[PDB]
Ligand binder design. Structure first.
Ligand SMILES: CCCCCCCCCCCCCCCCCC(=O)OC[C@H](CO[C@@H]1O[C@H](CO[C@H]2O[C@H](CO)[C@H](O)[C@H](O)[C@H]2O)[C@H](O)[C@H](O)[C@H]1O)OC(=O)CCCCCCCCCCCCCCCCC
Ligand code: CLA
Ligand code: CLA
Ligand code: CLA
Ligand code: CLA
Ligand code: CLA
Ligand code: CLA
Ligand SMILES: CC1=C(/C=C/C(C)=C/C=C/C(C)=C/C=C/C=C(C)/C=C/C=C(C)/C=C/C2=C(C)CCCC2(C)C)C(C)(C)CCC1
Ligand SMILES: CC1=C(/C=C/C(C)=C/C=C/C(C)=C/C=C/C=C(C)/C=C/C=C(C)/C=C/C2=C(C)CCCC2(C)C)C(C)(C)CCC1
Ligand SMILES: CC1=C(/C=C/C(C)=C/C=C/C(C)=C/C=C/C=C(C)/C=C/C=C(C)/C=C/C2=C(C)CCCC2(C)C)C(C)(C)CCC1
Ligand SMILES: CC1=C(/C=C/C(C)=C/C=C/C(C)=C/C=C/C=C(C)/C=C/C=C(C)/C=C/C2=C(C)CCCC2(C)C)C(C)(C)CCC1
Lengths: 306, 31, 441, 31, 61, 19, 75, 31, 34, 182, 37
């Protein structure tokens, strides 16, 4: 009957599967599975990694005395830099582990997987005959992930600067990032915080209004909302309201990702240090100065010289 | 011994995810 | 005299989408936009030359266009000194006048003129679904780009030379006479890996390779334009592309976003097409300069080994400390001091020329670190230095622009394919594709 | 007309203009 | 001739200001471009010739 | 050159099956 | 009443035109004459470090707070 | 002195834009 | 480890060729109606 | 438009031939769709539609085989009737797994009708059927110009007009030759 | 810097760079007058 290629192609693009595969799933599925397996194995059991390249390894495996809240997959060593580090370039497997190669493996496969996941979202949207813009919404978290794992190491010149694949590792990354860069006092991070908080606000309010509407409607909910906070002609159409819901968080996350990426090239946030002075040029402190003191503490504290 | 407990909890969560994905509940009427 | 939402179907915020079919209006819009581009170019050039002092280095004043002209080798002496600033002024004025001409042309074609050019001018009028004349326009513009590249080549080889920063004893303008046309070396960069150590095409070193590559690309572009003018797409191409204005726009958006990312990386890392004398030192360059200057000052007072050099993983000598990540740096002021096994101790001890030390100190002073409100130093450093490196501005801006244009590719490509399929307006509610599928059990 | 709308608008606006003038003058204070 | 250059350049600015408002007015106004061929053509010609005049005077100095 | 050899092998295999 | 009526009204425009600038200038004068520096107790640039105390002030008192603030401030 | 000239030139130039629109609204244009 | 490198290159190139040929095999979008 | 039970409403084949030659059950689903609910009635409607589509495809394949057998017996008439029946009861809005937008047998049916009218003296309807086949995505263009059955259609210039509309020469030899000469 | 011959025209040069960003605002106000029909 039909050639083997014909049947196999029909199977991939078949829409009767429990989980759609598509032509983007051929690259997404193996990459994501590789990343998942390597991440799980490294998290559970992996030798300590010499992150700083000074023969002082950091242990982040679950078998080396870490919890779930403390375990992590330590990023590659500083000595490696931006160099490509597959298994077959390491001198030996122990050497590969000691320099944090699994982090590079996981990051690469994960990024490929997420990009192909966006593609797969689009392709199924096309197959079902709906408008193809869920991928654009998904591009925000993908952009943030790319900024954290790929762009920032490029800007800083090393892969040891990427976010560790852990929880306490995430907190350490954030604290050190604030120390080096005033992330808090950067307009794009402010836009990101506004986006997240507004997303929470809008989700809660929309859910409450819609739930209270369904009784066994839209006009009553709109009247209630208008009487509440003086907005009678705000988002009367359901389509406009749902577009606003989609747009606000996505724009916020786009801008915060761009802020992080720009900081990767050392374009820091606002710096109001000693901005206020009285006569005779004596410095009067402000809240920015206390933030500066905290940043100075964090900066000075992690500068582990040998 | 704590590593066993952590790993078992993670595996249990993954198993629940698998069950929810595949052994799904058929929709009822009205819903 | 534009259309309306009920007349066309596009809201006011989507106004420009009403020009998809009208040809004359679209052409006028494009010409006016080109006029805006050239106007900005000229105005910015004039502004920078008006706020410029030849005594200070060009990268301590926030200049991004004067460096571009300097790289071409206009009014520049050996080592990066400025001889005369007239070329910048003449370039700015010429751009401004040409922009005025373009603006008049665009305004004319947009306000008063044939909305559709196909009725009276069959040569210019077009329809998106047509494939022969779209390829004709593609070929014309390919020829124009090839002529531009060949103009650059001719300028480099004749009528002055480009600024080669790798000339001995500090760079100077030189007339390239033996550009490398070897195919293997030219395409090695394209096949070159993008990861560290290799850096795809950002690793170009000598201006000879740049000019040879431009020769090759100009020739290829002219040939491709000629080929496209006289050819129609083969069946496979017609079977694997969406042929409409929005689809072409989507392809352009994707390509230009990728090019934006490439420009970001090239500006951040490369130092031959962006000489440090004009754009300042790169990050790795600044770190290596700091380490080198510390070594030189230490050994001066004293008068791998010397507690400033170590062994790289491969096994050669590199600068030590935290700057071991930047051991791939290749600076003109430091190559003379590098041997087959990385750095060689003897040359460091004996033949450090004075000019290299001064350049290294100057680069050490101004590292690519800054603040959004134009405050130099690290973030925790107080308000004492006003400096943000031009490389940082260029890289950040063009990364952001590339990212937004990739988002644009996604959006417009999705919309184009949906519209071509025919279900862009929504689900028909009568025979929906999902209702004809087996339930998901 | 002295309905609630008038009172609310004036209560929000009069101090707003006062403060705007105060800040605009504040800009020019010699340091 | 420096003062001559300044005055000619100021006249060029003034005529440019006239053009950047009049020409869109001529185009947009219905049938306002057919009845003003000579006016706009003379304005453009004067603008171009004055540009060349300023350029050549700068060339002398 | 391992890359080149592998790509040549995979492309040839596919083409040969078809022919 | 409707927005358009008040927007195009004459009495509204005349009264607001004659009143608002007076209040803007009133705020300007409030800042400039130094009255704001006194009512709210904000020190002017010169009297931040009094001769008696050359460092930042500190209360360290609750019930006698008023007198201590009198002393710390330059009055 | 030069600062005031900058502001007056900016005011004239920025008003030159809306001037066309207002004249077309009065004189009559496509708009 | 040359064997591992060869195996990984083979798998990667196989999957990439599958991707490219699959996206070629599709037929252009068209609107049956209108 | 083909009716639910044979015939034709504005056999379908019998009527079309001469012209050219010259709620209760599916209510729960509606109520669920009125709200934003999936429910169960939607499931039974989906199952019914899927089984109907499968049965329709089966029937269309069988009657295509019937038309082929009629050709084997040299009966152009009933075979053409079957062909336009197949075309008449094609799904209204069909999106294939490979983004086809048309049932695969639709193209071959269009081509077979074009060939039938190529044998039959009347031609221009053969040109229209061939145009419909080309638009539907009859990707292979070789027997379009090689089949002896289509020589009669090839006589008319409109055949070449349509073929050039869909199959255009890749390279313009005339233009390059003229440029070389000049 | 800018040639002395054109020195008095420095302020206009300083003003030129910010002109183009006014065109989007011009389009917006033009729509406003037209009432976004
Ligand atoms: C594919 C994805 C990128 C992978 C490569 C990442 C990388 O490390 O790329 C780095 C390379 C440059 O490599 C560098 O190239 C440099 C070349 O400089 C050398 O040569 C120069 C010659 O003058 C100088 O002399 C210099 O001093 C000298 O060191 C060095 O070799 C460095 O070590 C080397 O790392 O960038 C490039 O080539 C261009 C790469 C462009 C893409 C990068 C951005 C991708 C962003 C994806 C997310 C976007 C958002 C998505 C939203 C959804
Ligand atoms: C890409 C931009 C573009 C395009 C496609 C067109 C296309 C057209 N224009 Mg428009 N026009 C443009 C730019 C453009 N013009 C500009 C910038 C101006 C301002 C000067 C005008 C002013 C203008 C007027 C006033 C008129 C047209 C007319 C026309 C039509 C007839 C062609 C013509 O002028 O005959 C001339 C064609 C020739 C081949 C003569 C020789 C021209 C040589 C080749 C000049 C080459 C210039 C060179 C390449 C410049 C390179 C600069 C580079 C460095 C950027 C045609 C539809 C006419 C028309 O019918 O109205 C719609 C008309 O009356 N145009
Ligand atoms: C730079 C970007 C750009 C460009 C080139 C255009 C160009 C165009 N638009 Mg689009 N548009 C834009 C941005 C842009 N627009 C934006 C941001 C919006 C959202 C507000 C719109 C919304 C929009 C709508 C809703 C519509 C257009 C339409 C049009 C076309 C006719 C408009 C018209 O008659 O103007 C008339 C303008 C006036 C009467 C007032 C301004 C007069 C002049 C031109 C102002 C500039 C003078 C200039 C500075 C001086 C030149 C001097 C020189 C000679 C030396 C024209 C091709 C229309 C069209 O053709 O669609 C079918 C249409 O319906 N546009
Ligand atoms: C990509 C192109 C580019 C690049 C690399 C630069 C780079 C630079 N410019 Mg140039 N400039 C540009 C485009 C560019 N500019 C354009 C288009 C204009 C015309 C408007 C100017 C006009 C201009 C002037 C007039 C001057 C400069 C100057 C400078 C320098 C200092 C900039 C500074 O202090 O940052 C300031 C940074 C900011 C104010 C932050 C802006 C951040 C972005 C743009 C905001 C984006 C909008 C917002 C996020 C959207 C909100 C969304 C909403 C949902 C909330 C720097 C070298 C100065 C200099 O030193 O020259 C000698 C100077 O005097 N530029
Ligand atoms: C004869 C066919 C032909 C030719 C030659 C062109 C040429 C051009 N078109 Mg295209 N166009 C055509 C047909 C053609 N078009 C048709 C049929 C249409 C459909 C109506 C269009 C629609 C169209 C649009 C919509 C647009 C163009 C644009 C352009 C210009 C882009 C210039 C640029 O940015 O280059 C970049 C590279 C360079 C400038 C380097 C090349 C340097 C020069 C040109 C070569 C050196 C030799 C030169 C002749 C000497 C110049 C001397 C001069 C200084 C006095 C270019 C001049 C764009 C534009 O902005 O036009 C102004 C634009 O937006 N065209
Ligand atoms: C921006 C300029 C431009 C644009 C838009 C196009 C656009 C097009 N060209 Mg032209 N072309 C150009 C420049 C350009 N070309 C130049 C400079 C040359 C001279 C070398 C040619 C020579 C040329 C020929 C000889 C042919 C085309 C063809 C085509 C069409 C098919 C798609 C395509 O190019 O293959 C893109 C590729 C695919 C869609 C399939 C994917 C195959 C692989 C993945 C990519 C191709 C190999 C790649 C170039 C090498 C690097 C591989 C790397 C990405 C892994 C399309 C209309 C073909 C056609 O039918 O037109 C007549 C054709 O036969 N072009
Ligand atoms: C040259 C590239 C290009 C071209 C020609 C077009 C052309 C078009 N687009 Mg596309 N688009 C592009 C790039 C492009 N776009 C990019 C890069 C993006 C991603 C951001 C989009 C996203 C996009 C969407 C989401 C939509 C369009 C739409 C449209 C159509 C109407 C334009 C419109 O909204 O009116 C004029 C536009 C406006 C008045 C909006 C301007 C408001 C912006 C946000 C202000 C930003 C200012 C700020 C300083 C920018 C710097 C930010 C900084 C952080 C970098 C038109 C066919 C619309 C449509 O109907 O599609 C058919 C539509 O819905 N486009
Ligand atoms: C259509 C329209 C539009 C747009 C448009 C445009 C974009 C246009 C452009 C235009 C343009 C773009 C124009 C330009 C012009 C220019 C000019 C007019 C110039 C002049 C010059 C001069 C005058 C100079 C002077 C000088 C010099 C020479 C240098 C230095 C010194 C001085 C400064 C003196 C819109 C969308 C908005 C809306 C609708 C309407
Ligand atoms: C000048 C220069 C140089 C060089 C240059 C060159 C050599 C270039 C080349 C270039 C090239 C060589 C390019 C290429 C490109 C390619 C591409 C870009 C591709 C793409 C693809 C795509 C896009 C696809 C798509 C698709 C598919 C896959 C199939 C079907 C479907 C679709 C269509 C979707 C040198 C270095 C010497 C020096 C420096 C500078
Ligand atoms: C002031 C100054 C100066 C100047 C000079 C001169 C002499 C200038 C001129 C200028 C000019 C004199 C300009 C012009 C421009 C033009 C343009 C920019 C055009 C364009 C065109 C186009 C673009 C076209 C296109 C087309 C046509 C129409 C044909 C065919 C088709 C086509 C589309 C291709 C001097 C050095 C003495 C001194 C310093 C300062
Ligand atoms: C180069 C030159 C020149 C030129 C100039 C020009 C070209 C100009 C243009 C100009 C313009 C073109 C302007 C425009 C303006 C506009 C405006 C000023 C607007 C405004 C608007 C607004 C403010 C709005 C608002 C609003 C809101 C708030 C929301 C949205 C919408 C609306 C409307 C409602 C001059 C003469 C300097 C000098 C000579 C040389």
């Amino acid at each position: 009957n039909s050639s083997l290629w014909a049947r196999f192609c029909e199977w991939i693009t078949s829409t009767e599967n429990r989980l759609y595969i598509g032509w983007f799933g051929v690259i997404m599925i193996p990459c994501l599975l590789t990343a998942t397996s390597v991440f799980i194995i490294a998290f559970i059991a992996a030798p300590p990694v010499d992150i700083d390249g000074i023969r002082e390894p950091v242990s982040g495996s679950l078998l080396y005395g870490n919890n779930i809240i403390t375990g992590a997959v330590i990023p590659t060593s500083n000595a490696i830099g931006l160099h490509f580090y597959p298994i077959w370039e390491a001198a030996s497997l122990d050497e590969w582990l000691y320099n944090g190669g699994p982090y590079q493996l996981i990051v690469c496969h994960f990024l490929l997987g997420v990009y192909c996941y966006m593609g797969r979202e689009w392709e199924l949207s096309f197959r079902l005959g709906m408008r193809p813009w869920i991928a654009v919404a998904y591009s925000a978290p993908v952009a943030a992930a790319s900024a954290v794992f790929l762009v920032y190491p490029i800007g800083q010149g090393s892969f040891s600067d990427g976010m560790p694949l852990g929880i306490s590792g995430t907190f350490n990354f954030m604290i050190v990032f604030q120390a080096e860069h005033n992330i808090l006092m950067h307009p794009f991070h402010m836009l990101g915080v506004a986006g997240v908080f507004g997303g929470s606000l809008f989700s809660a309010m929309h859910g409450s209004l819609v739930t209270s509407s369904l009784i066994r409607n839209i006009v009553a909910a709109h009247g209630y909302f208008g009487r509440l906070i003086f907005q009678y002609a705000s988002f009367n159409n359901s389509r406009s309201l749902h577009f606003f819901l989609a747009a606000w968080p996505v724009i916020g996350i786009w801008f915060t990702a761009l802020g992080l990426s720009t900081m990767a090239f050392n374009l820091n946030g606002f710096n109001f240090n000693q901005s206020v002075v009285d006569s005779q040029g004596r410095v009067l402190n402000t809240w920015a100065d206390i933030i500066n003191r905290a940043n100075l503490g964090m900066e000075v504290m992690h500068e582990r010289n040998a | 011994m704590e590593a066993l407990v952590y790993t078992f909890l993670l595996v249990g969560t993954l198993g629940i995810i698998f069950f929810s994905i595949f052994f799904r509940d058929p929709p009822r009427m009205i819903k | 005299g534009g259309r309306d939402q009920e007349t066309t179907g596009f809201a006011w915020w989507s106004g420009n989408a009403r020009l998809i079919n009208l040809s004359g209006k679209l052409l006028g819009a494009h010409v006016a936009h080109a006029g805006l581009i050239v106007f900005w170019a000229g105005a910015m050039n004039l502004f920078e030359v008006s706020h410029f002092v030849p005594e200070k280095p060009m990268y301590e004043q926030g200049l991004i266009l004067l460096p571009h002209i300097a790289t071409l080798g206009y009014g520049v002496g050996p080592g990066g000194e400025i001889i005369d600033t007239f070329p910048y002024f003449v370039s700015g004025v010429l751009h401004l006048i040409s922009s005025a001409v373009l603006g008049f042309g665009g305004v004319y074609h947009s306000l008063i003129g044939p909305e559709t050019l196909e009725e009276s001018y069959p040569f210019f009028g077009y329809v998106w679904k047509d494939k022969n004349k779209m390829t004709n326009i593609l070929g014309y513009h390919l020829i124009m780009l090839g002529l531009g590249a060949w103009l650059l080549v001719w300028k480099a080889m004749y009528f002055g030379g480009v600024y080669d920063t790798w000339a001995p004893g500090g760079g100077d303008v030189r007339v390239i006479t033996n550009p490398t046309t070897n195919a293997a070396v030219i395409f090695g960069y394209l096949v070159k890996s993008p990861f560290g150590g290799d850096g795809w095409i950002c690793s170009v070193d000598n201006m000879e390779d740049i000019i040879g590559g431009h020769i090759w690309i100009g020739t290829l572009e002219i040939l491709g334009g000629i080929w496209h003018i006289y050819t129609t797409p083969w069946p496979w191409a017609r079977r694997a592309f969406v042929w409409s204005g929005e689809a072409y726009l989507s392809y352009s958006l994707g390509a230009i976003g990728v090019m934006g990312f490439i420009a970001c990386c090239m500006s951040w890392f490369n130092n031959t097409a962006y000489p440090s004398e004009f754009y300042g030192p790169t990050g790795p360059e600044a770190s290596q300069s700091q380490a080198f200057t510390f070594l030189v000052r230490d050994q001066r007072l004293g008068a791998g080994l010397g507690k400033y050099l170590m062994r790289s993983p491969t096994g050669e000598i590199i600068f030590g400390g935290e700057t071991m990540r930047f051991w791939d740096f290749r600076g003109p002021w430091l190559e003379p001091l590098r041997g087959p096994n990385g750095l060689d101790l003897n040359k460091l001890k004996n033949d450090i020329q004075p000019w290299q030390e001064r350049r290294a100190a100057e680069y050490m002073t101004h590292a690519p670190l800054g603040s959004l409100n134009s405050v130099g130093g690290v973030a925790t450093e107080i308000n004492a230095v006003n400096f943000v490196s031009p490389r940082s501005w260029l890289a950040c801006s063009h990364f952001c622009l590339g990212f937004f244009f990739f988002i644009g590719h996604l959006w417009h490509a999705g919309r184009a394919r949906a519209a071509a399929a025919g279900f862009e307006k929504g689900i028909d509610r009568f025979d929906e594709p999902v209702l004809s599928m087996r339930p998901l059990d | 007309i002295f309905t609630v709308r008038w009172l609310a608008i004036h209560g929000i606006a009069v101090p707003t203009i006062f403060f705007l003038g105060a800040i605009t003058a504040m800009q020019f204070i010699q340091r | 001739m420096t003062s001559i250059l300044q005055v000619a350049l100021l006249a060029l600015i003034f005529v440019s200001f006239a053009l950047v408002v009049g020409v869109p007015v001529v185009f947009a106004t219905p049938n306002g471009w057919t009845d003003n061929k000579g006016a706009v053509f003379s304005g453009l010609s004067l603008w171009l010739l004055l540009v060349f005049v300023v350029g050549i005077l700068n060339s002398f100095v | 050159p391992v890359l080149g050899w592998v790509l040549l092998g995979v492309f040839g295999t596919m083409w040969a099956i078809w022919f | 009443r409707p927005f358009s009526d008040i927007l195009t009204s004459i009495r509204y425009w005349v009264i607001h035109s004659i009143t608002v600038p007076a209040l803007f200038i009133a705020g300007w004068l409030f800042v400039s004459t130094g009255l704001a520096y006194d009512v709210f107790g904000t020190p002017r640039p010169n009297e931040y470090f009094t001769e008696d105390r050359q460092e930042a002030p500190l209360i360290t008192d609750r019930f006698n707070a008023l007198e201590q603030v009198k002393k710390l401030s330059g009055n | 002195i030069e600062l005031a000239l900058t502001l007056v030139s900016l005011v004239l130039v920025v008003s030159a834009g809306p001037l066309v629109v207002v004249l077309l609204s009065a004189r009559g244009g496509n708009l | 480890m040359l064997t591992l490198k060869i195996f990984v290159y083979t798998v990667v190139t196989f999957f990439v060729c599958l991707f490219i040929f699959g996206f070629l095999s599709n037929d252009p979008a068209r609107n049956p109606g209108k | 438009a083909r009716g639910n039970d044979g015939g034709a409403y504005i056999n379908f084949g019998q009527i079309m031939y001469a012209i050219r030659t010259r709620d209760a059950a599916e209510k729960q689903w509606k109520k669920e769709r009125a709200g934003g609910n999936y429910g169960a009635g939607t499931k039974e409607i989906q199952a019914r539609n899927y089984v109907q589509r499968k049965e329709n495809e089966r029937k269309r394949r069988e009657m295509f085989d019937d038309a082929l057998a009629k050709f084997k017996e040299n009966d152009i008439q009933g075979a053409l009737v079957e062909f336009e029946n197949i075309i008449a009861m094609e799904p209204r809005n069909f999106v294939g797994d490979n983004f086809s937008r048309n049932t695969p047998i639709y193209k071959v049916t269009q081509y077979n009708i074009a060939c039938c009218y190529s044998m039959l003296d009347q031609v221009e309807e053969a040109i229209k059927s061939l145009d419909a086949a080309m638009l539907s995505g009859f990707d292979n263009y070789d027997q379009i110009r090689r089949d002896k059955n289509l020589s009669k259609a090839r006589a008319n210039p409109k055949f070449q007009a349509v073929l050039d509309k869909y199959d255009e020469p890749v390279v313009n030899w005339n233009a390059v030759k003229a440029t070389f000469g000049a | 810097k800018l040639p002395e011959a054109y020195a008095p025209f420095a302020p206009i040069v300083d003003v030129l760079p910010v002109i183009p960003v006014f065109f989007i605002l011009l389009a917006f106000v033009w729509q406003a007058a037209v009432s976004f029909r």
